[PDB]
UniProtKB/Swiss-Prot annotation, chain A:
Beta-D-glucose 2 binds at residues 353, 356, 698-699. It is found in: Cytoplasm. It comes from Ignavibacterium album (strain DSM 19864 / JCM 16511 / NBRC 101810 / Mat9-16). The active site is at 171 (proton donor/acceptor), 338 (nucleophile). Sophorose binds at residues 47, 94, 96-97, 170-171, 273-274, 338, 344, 373. The lineage of its organism: Bacteria, Pseudomonadati, Ignavibacteriota, Ignavibacteria, Ignavibacteriales. This is Beta-1,2-glucosyltransferase.
Length: 706, 703
């Protein structure tokens, strides 16, 4: 029961390459398509830029009347002739390093100030950055759809055209995220006031939750400036809930408009979050799509992977992101809408030898399809390049359609996929560990992020000490998930929201990284999990508040935990590992009632315990560790071993990463060497040992029959 | 010509390894020192931790009475017996991931409130962090010196002992940097007031500079919070100057105390600033030692180089840092007091094959000595590690003196260095390009840094648009310097403060990355440079203000420049290069009378001019570009070619970096491959070689 794309009721690996017709000499379009097809790619992908085709207000060219490379119709016809399916992405935003992110110059000059995203002061955040639900913006977006959408509709697969998929806009919220500011446009404010009225019904109900003293809803303003009171936190938390409804309204409006043209193809969206070759903030961005993914089973989200290099420094980002996408979208294949090929920036090199390993590591890490971005380099015509004339470097093909070094790497990877896809797409890893994804810890893009200008969340001011962003980046993303991957223990991630208990009972262990706050439903779910026979590992805190920081002690009471928070040395001992460095002086100190103490402070106070509760097991650690020392890996390994979980292989070099994927028929062993060392090692199945030599930053794949 | 260490009257490449006796099994001390010597290393370096030897107040153990690893006397004997010189570093601060950063637990327990660094509300910043000039802190510091300095004096090189250098404290100011927090201890603020009174003499003089409305110096409060007004910018600027004098005062008290024991060896200090494997902030940290470097020509500053990996992503960091240290310390060798060996962080790998390439690149980039940090791993004794049990990973030796992969890399690099040091140390690059270092742009560690979470400096609130940190990081460090190195053009850096005109006239071009403000002295210096025959390249602004943001247009008026600041598309054309991405909407649009327009906005407005002024040449670009496109390399290459500057070689692969080092007799060509690609290329003077990924090749030529 893997999820994978299907062609004529067979497992099909979606292999696309991105080829920007608008940035290639049209005399060479066919050569680019033939060379893509010759790699074993089945699909080609492109933006259709609004700025490129609405050359002036109400002057459209899709036929190359005014510039040969405006002949979208001819590009579509060539894709059909060269037996490639086509993904089209008509925006309105395309990003794509295109002037004004794809929006017409004439549009941005004409729009009045209230079409734009505005800061708390009423000023324009950026001259390219519109307010998504601006009446003016959506009027012009609709007139752009009125011209491009009939073309897309006529050329759909169901009309024997090549068009199989369409992206709606591009990375909703990404422009906002990188700007470092949130949108306070008066459309946003007014929609937020309606959301608050709908949510609370009476000002008394809102006052009771927030601990505010408003006389009426007319006194409540959209939250701005720093969080100083728990009532400011509550307002911001609802502001985050609102923005998820807001992005759902945007994509809904676009989708309803598109469907009205007879467009029945698969609709997509693309997830931003990588920056400087890490993706620790991506889970924050995917979390902004929570309401889209609940309301639209028919929009498939795909990842925009930009690793830039392939090493232990970022080995864990693609797997964690693939796992988190699966957690939020479990009924669709994990795929990369944008799968790095070459480099968007001259000064940031993309080596074929890095990317080839990333491609193989992505297959190890469960990817089921991808679109090489950029397969073909572009040259911007007519000064449309945001940052210079050349679009991408170190691609598979240069703009002229010459093969570059990466072409042979992609041909190699694609050849393996086409030979193995029928088995490989149907393989799973044996995950005996589940890691809880608690989305509200990620709902901070308005107040706390790697990219927000203003740090608005200081939890110490609220009488708290566990910052949710610190927890989800350093304890979970760069900590637990990194540690498990480094130790070669398979894990799955499961979204705790509306989570079915039956979807947790298959695991030997459930791991919850918890702050001091957690909603009643999740506290009850984890309670029922243990009582019914589940094995829970919970740290660094038993929560005692709900998402509004009001009292909620359900899980503490159901587990018979008593604790006091006390200051000590950062270093604790745990399971007989000395000098385990922990993130906080404050730790939870548990009494040893009906429990085994397994962790101790420098004053020998109990900061961790194990107990049996109903049919289940609980391990609580009152301290925070990620992976910033060897003791942290020793501690994770010890915790996993509490339930006799074993690695799939014995490998003589602990720095070698492996993944075993198998079904009934076949076993694939992926070895990954994320280190600048030629490694010679031996291995065997945990049930004579084979010797292997692996180059720096390289891979081996072994296939076994049975 | 060149500055280098000397041994037996000959050029000597200082090869030191860091070995923390206090973190090593004393039964294996001799074994560590023998394995270090066997790599060809000549020196061993260590902290002498105050907490480790003053075990209780006025109870000193330097002879292993209470713990065998407290036997400093025996470690010194072993260095002598195994023929290694010794660098000692007795603090008071040692940092070194040692609990309390090396200060005794008993001291920190007992010190009054007024001995600690205080926030602007009078609260202790950190139970770890004393005020450097606390009378109570210096009293106890001095009682520690009274016991450890006689031991160092005994064994110092001027008494023919093994101790050749001593470090004073450790990374002075590093805590103000990483925290963003200034010390507001009333003792520090009293010193700040004295500094201001001494500087301005009367409140009237200060009011005329700051545009303040004080009736006396009694109305004057230390700056704090966000800069909202130009008067706040002025106060914070002098607060930065004050902290450079404050650090000078601290190091001077330590130095005078040390000299009183008759310790006459070379004193040192160490420069922090690398994080996450780049060093774009280190020039800010070096700027904090400006007053020390001016007043103490007998204190050698060395660099703390922490590259973490070796690729095109960080290739430019170590050269830029080495060049800026040479600019501020021209009479002493450029050396790394802490030269990455292994990793402080288990999860941040240090590959022997990366570090080997970094060591050879350091030689190409002009390093004259270094101290492998950490040569030997350590095990923290009885809880005294701030982090876990282990100190460093992937070192040359583990804590039990096991050889690890890096050992063989250090032995190979050391053998090369010993074979070549007599000629290599006496080689320089031929730099025809000089890049100006304007230190006031770097004086922002209290208000604007990569480490400072929230920014106190927002120049738009002051009617400016060129932020000095954005300029010195993106336009200068990751822009011009990265670009010249990528293009294989030699540059030197020169400190513009008190700068000799004579020392600019050797160069065919001087490059100035200018904000809207620049002091009268530097404006006068650059005026005289061009008028006397110099070729100046200046962008992205003709300055119009001084360091206090008061009108100063000396350079503008001397050069006959007129401009209006106007908004346009980020892209300009320059020297016929289309689509040059520039940082700002706002650009300087120049009157072109007596001038050649060479750059244009999307609307064809003149945003760059060339001009003859007296006997020299001026190139002004009213726009900011770094290195974020191939057009940026094209533009730097075009600008360098205006004065017919040539690379020292033609190399067939543009992605191969090279450094040609020569003297009259000897040439070394260092080829560096910072890319994950096997490269085959050929070279000739302005012959076909293969280099592995992240690797190197050195070629010698007799002249
Ligand atoms: O300039 N801009 O407004 C702008 C620039 C870049 C941008 O996104 C791009 O860079 C992000 C950071 O690396 C990626 O996470 C994202 O996937 C990618 O598409 C969006 C807007
Ligand atoms: O926690 N602390 O108080 C603390 C931590 C680290 C520290 O300095 C160390 O790390 C810096 C940042 O990477 C380096 O630039 C510097 O060279 C090195 O010595 C100083 C104090
Ligand atoms: Ca003039």
């Amino acid at each position: 029961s893997e999820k994978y794309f299907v062609k004529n009721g067979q497992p099909h690996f979606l292999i696309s390459g991105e080829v920007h017709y608008f940035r290639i000499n049209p005399k060479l379009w066919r050569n680019h398509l033939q060379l893509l097809k010759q790699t074993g790619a089945d699909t080609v992908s492109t933006y259709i830029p609004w700025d490129w085709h609405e050359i002036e207000e109400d002057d459209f060219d899709f036929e190359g009347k005014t510039h040969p490379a405006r002949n979208l119709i001819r590009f579509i016809k060539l894709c059909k002739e060269e037996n490639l399916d086509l993904i089209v992405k008509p925006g309105p935003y395309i990003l794509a390093e295109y002037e004004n992110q794809g929006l017409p110059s004439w549009l941005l000059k004409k729009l009045s100030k209230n079409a734009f995203a505005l800061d708390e002061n009423g000023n324009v955040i950026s001259p390219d950055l519109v307010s998504y639900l601006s009446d003016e913006f959506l009027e012009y977006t609709f007139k752009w759809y009125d011209k491009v959408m009939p073309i897309i509709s006529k050329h759909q697969k169901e009309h024997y055209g090549p068009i199989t998929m369409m992206q709606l806009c591009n990375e909703i919220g990404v422009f906002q995220w990188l700007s470092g500011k949130s949108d306070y446009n008066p459309k946003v404010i007014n929609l937020y006031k309606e959301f608050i009225i709908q949510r609370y019904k009476t000002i008394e109900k809102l006052n009771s939750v927030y601990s505010t003293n408003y006389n009426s809803f007319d006194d409540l303003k959209a939250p701005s400036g720093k969080i100083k009171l728990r009532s400011d936190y509550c307002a911001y938390f609802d502001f985050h809930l609102f923005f998820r409804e807001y992005y759902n309204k945007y994509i809904s409006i676009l989708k309803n408009k598109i469907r009205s043209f007879g467009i029945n193809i698969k609709l997509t969206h693309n997830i931003p979050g990588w920056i400087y070759g890490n993706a620790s903030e991506l889970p924050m961005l995917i979390s902004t799509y929570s309401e889209i993914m609940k309301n639209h089973p028919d929009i498939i989200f795909g990842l925009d992977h930009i690793p830039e290099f392939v090493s232990f420094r970022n080995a864990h980002s693609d797997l964690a992101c693939n796992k988190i996408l699966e957690a939020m979208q479990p009924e669709a294949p994990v795929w990369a809408a944008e799968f790095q090929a070459g480099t968007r920036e001259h000064h940031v090199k993309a080596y074929a030898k890095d990317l080839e390993t990333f491609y193989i590591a992505s297959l190890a890490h469960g990817i089921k399809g991808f679109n090489y971005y950029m397969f073909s380099q572009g040259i911007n015509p007519e000064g449309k390049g945001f940052y210079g004339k050349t679009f991408y470097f170190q691609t598979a093909l240069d703009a002229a359609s010459n093969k570059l070094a990466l072409y042979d790497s992609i041909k190699k990877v694609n050849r393996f996929i086409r030979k193995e896809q029928k088995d490989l797409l149907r393989t799973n890893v044996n995950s005996e560990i589940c890691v809880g994804f608690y989305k509200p810890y990620f709902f901070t893009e308005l107040i706390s992020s790697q990219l927000l200008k203003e740090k608005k969340l200081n939890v110490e001011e609220l009488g708290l000490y566990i910052d949710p962003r610190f927890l989800r980046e350093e304890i979970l993303f760069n900590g637990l998930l990194r540690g498990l991957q480094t130790l070669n223990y398979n894990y799955d991630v499961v979204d705790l929201e509306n989570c079915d208990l039956k979807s947790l009972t298959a695991y030997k262990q459930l791991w919850i990284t918890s702050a001091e706050f957690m909603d009643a439903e999740t506290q009850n779910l984890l309670s029922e999990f243990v009582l019914n026979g589940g094995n829970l590992i919970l740290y660094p805190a038993v929560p005692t508040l709900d998402n509004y920081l009001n009292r909620c002690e359900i899980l503490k009471n159901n587990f018979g935990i008593e604790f006091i928070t006390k200051d000590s040395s950062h270093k604790v001992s745990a399971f007989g590992i000395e000098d385990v460095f922990t993130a906080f002086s404050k730790k939870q100190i548990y009494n040893d009632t009906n429990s085994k103490p397994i962790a101790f402070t420098q004053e020998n106070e109990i900061c961790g315990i194990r107990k049996k509760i109903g049919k289940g097991e609980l391990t609580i650690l009152g301290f925070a560790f990620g992976y910033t020392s060897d003791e942290h890996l020793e501690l994770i390994d010890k915790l996993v071993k509490l339930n006799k979980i074993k690695r799939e292989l014995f490998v003589s070099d602990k720095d070698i990463q492996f993944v075993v994927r198998e079904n009934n028929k076949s076993r694939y062993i992926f070895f990954l060497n994320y280190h600048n060392e030629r490694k010679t090692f031996n291995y065997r199945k945990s049930s004579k040992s084979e010797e292997i030599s692996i180059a720096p930053f390289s891979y081996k794949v072994i296939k076994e029959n049975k």
